């Protein structure tokens, strides 16, 4: 395989060319959340809107705990919801034209990769069990 990832630096504080307060970032991220944007998109729009590194550095904690604190939690986590959305999209395309055997293969693979994460989420019990992908 290959490596391509971020390299979060050695410092663990706000990078001191910052010229902005702490709760203003909280207001910005709850504003984007009430606009209805997913947490990873909050993270990139906060990397580029005003110069934060990420919220665990600039605020006191991560965006998932700060959105659960501000009351805008997601009922299912990001990767779970995105794999479900990809699964239903490729299922809709295959039911448009059933001859796509590569889409059948990829639907089986996405079903496996979502049942693995559903097994993890049920065994850690952060979503309510009986949840087994419809």
């Amino acid at each position: 395989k290959g490596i391509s990832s971020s390299a979060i630096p050695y410092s663990r504080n706000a990078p001191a060319w910052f010229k902005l307060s702490s709760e203003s970032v909280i207001e910005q991220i709850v504003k984007y959340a009430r606009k209805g944007l997913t947490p990873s998109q909050i993270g990139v729009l906060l990397r580029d809107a005003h110069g934060v590194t990420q919220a665990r550095v600039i605020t006191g904690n991560k965006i998932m705990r700060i959105l659960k604190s501000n009351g805008l939690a997601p009922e299912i986590p990001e990767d779970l919801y995105y794999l479900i959305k990809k699964a239903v999209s490729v299922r809709k395309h295959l039911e448009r034209n059933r001859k796509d055997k590569d889409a059948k293969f990829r639907l089986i693979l996405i079903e496996s990769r979502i049942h693995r994460l559903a097994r993890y989420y049920r065994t850690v019990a952060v979503l309510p069990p009986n949840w087994k992908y419809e």
């Binding site: 959340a33 606009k35 209805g36 944007l37 997913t38 998109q41 009351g71 805008l72 939690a73 997601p74 009922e75 299912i76 990001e78 919801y81």
Partner: peptide, 22 residues
């Protein structure tokens, strides 16, 4: 820019409330 119509607890409460009402 590319908001979701789902995936938030309060938004799916609003969606099920709209389905309950009409």
């Amino acid at each position: 820019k590319k908001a979701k119509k789902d995936f938030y607890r309060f938004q799916v409460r609003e969606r099920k409330k709209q389905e309950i009402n009409q």
